[PDB]
Amino acid sequence: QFAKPEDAVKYRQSAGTLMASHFGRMTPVVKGQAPYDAAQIKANVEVLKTLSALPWAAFGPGTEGGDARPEIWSDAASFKQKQQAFQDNIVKLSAAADAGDLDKLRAAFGDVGASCKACHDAYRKK
Amino acid sequence: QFAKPEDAVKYRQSAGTLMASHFGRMTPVVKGQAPYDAAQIKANVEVLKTLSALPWAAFGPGTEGGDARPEIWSDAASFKQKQQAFQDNIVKLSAAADAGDLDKLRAAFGDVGASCKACHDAYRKK
Numbered sequence A, B: 001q002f003a004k005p006e007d008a009v010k011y012r013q014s015a016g017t018l019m020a021s022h023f024g025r026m027t028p029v030v031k032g033q034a035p036y037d038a039a040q041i042k043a044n045v046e047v048l049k050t051l052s053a054l055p056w057a058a059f060g061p062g063t064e065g066g067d068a069r070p071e072i073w074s075d076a077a078s079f080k081q082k083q084q085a086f087q088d089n090i091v092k093l094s095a096a097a098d099a100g101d102l103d104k105l106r107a108a109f110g111d112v113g114a115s116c117k118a119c120h121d122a123y124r125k126k
């Protein structure tokens, strides 16, 4: 769907921006600094679920640029393992949110955050 | 969810970027220049549905900036009518996509595009 590689870069960066907001806005809830409303979090995690499927198709052939490392493309199976494992972590977060289980939500939130960081550490330029 | 107004601006602009990609990528399909796969379009319109609910909460009190006009805030009911009507247009597009009805999809796509443009014309700086 991208006319030029720059359009793929713009897309995936914007997807990252929105994920960071929908993930990070739950930090005060996880920490107990903001109240836990199960329905609010369930709805927010649904949005995050949708968003977290979006970046990967915007690292398609010929879309090199931005702060994306070339090893994303030269090690395609490995990058794919990381995005699939991340999306698995999001499924765990969705299950916790859908159950209304705050302890499960805390734990799953931490594992999602670790998955974001692990990919950025390997595949995003500093 | 925004620490500063600049964070709300960044969010709503990124939501616009993603909407433009998920809407605009269907232009060749509507025109018949690309094939129509009902399931592919149904899934894409679902993504667009989710995205098209997102900008409005990022024009909250104190979030003035970017290319957003002040009348967004001073005429709150009117701006709200436009975003609600736009989301209604997206419901029509979803119904067309879910039905697998290409004629309905063409018509609904045009009405969605007109709704994007009408809001930008009134509320986005040139």
Ligand code: HEC
Residues within 6 Å of the ligand: A009, A012, A013, A014, A016, A017, A019, A020, A021, A023, A065, A066, A067, A068, A069, A079, A082, A083, A086, A112, A113, A115, A116, A117, A119, A120, A123, A124
């Ligand atoms: C690899 C499997 C990733 C996972 C998991 C997550 N992110 Fe990511 N992100 C990744 C790359 C390779 C890039 C660079 C894209 C480019 O071309 O520049 C990014 C970028 C971001 C950004 C910055 C966007 C920008 O302003 O330029 C953000 C804010 C971001 N990513 C957030 C984010 C979050 C919150 C994640 C987990 C919920 C997450 N990413 C996972 C690769 C990967």
Ligand code: HEC
Residues within 6 Å of the ligand: B009, B012, B013, B014, B016, B017, B019, B020, B021, B023, B065, B066, B067, B068, B069, B079, B082, B083, B086, B112, B113, B115, B116, B117, B119, B120, B123, B124
């Ligand atoms: C009002 C009810 C709007 C409707 C309907 C749509 N958009 Fe919009 N959009 C609106 C404003 C006020 C702004 C400016 C935001 C700011 O603070 O700068 C925008 C911006 C965009 C952008 C530009 C993002 C950027 O790169 O800075 C895009 C690409 C965009 N909008 C796309 C878009 C599409 C495709 C829409 C219909 C599917 C749509 N917008 C509707 C206000 C409104």
